[PDB]
Design a protein around this ligand. Structure first.
Ligand code: TCN
Lengths: 63, 63, 65, 65
């Protein structure tokens, strides 16, 4: 089918993230999809091009 | 602005859905969001106009 | 054996309007029963009982906007 | 006390090619430890060991176009 993450964002605070999901590319979407869940319930798409996502993964692996 | 769901789908088979999340409108996104995760780990957005979602809630709960 | 259900117990006095998200998980190898996890806007997470129509009120409330 | 850890046991013998998605969940009220849940292409879920680098390879794989 198709990508869900058509619009990505970087205007977010690592500290507000509670979880991150990486969906690999395949027939449904030619690129990886990174969906972050804020602590308040909201979900946003991250851009793999920004390294923000690597900071998120370190903070999550810490706590 | 920061919506995950920019484009929906009404073409799926509920059999394939492992979970459904209902997100309310807020500051990131002005409209409710219906994200379905397929058994494979892939996500799709559903239309709240189409009641397939209702079909899907029923099936997940009485399963 | 590898994984267990995330929901220990269910809660029932919540106000449909304190919820920012509702997640419906089917039964599977991961957990033998379907689960209803609601996120309060405060970030607290609770599980609801599918045998309480409260979840239907939340879903109605969440689709509003 | 409504939620608990879903990850009981971790797995180390998986082919990075079988994984379709990975979820990293930080610690909090629900579980005092982070959890790495992978969904294989088969619909099956498993927990990865973070103090093992099998997960590093998977991340790298999942990030390729
Ligand atoms: N009950 C329980 Ni746990 C177990 N076994 C874990 N890990 C938790 N929380």
């Amino acid at each position: 089918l198709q990508c869900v993450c058509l619009k990505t964002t970087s205007g977010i605070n690592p500290r507000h993230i509670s979880s991150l999901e990486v969906i690999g590319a395949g027939l449904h979407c030619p690129s990886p999809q990174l969906i972050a869940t804020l602590k308040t319930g909201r979900k946003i798409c991250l851009d793999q091009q920004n390294p923000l996502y690597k900071k998120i993964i370190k903070r999550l692996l810490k706590s």
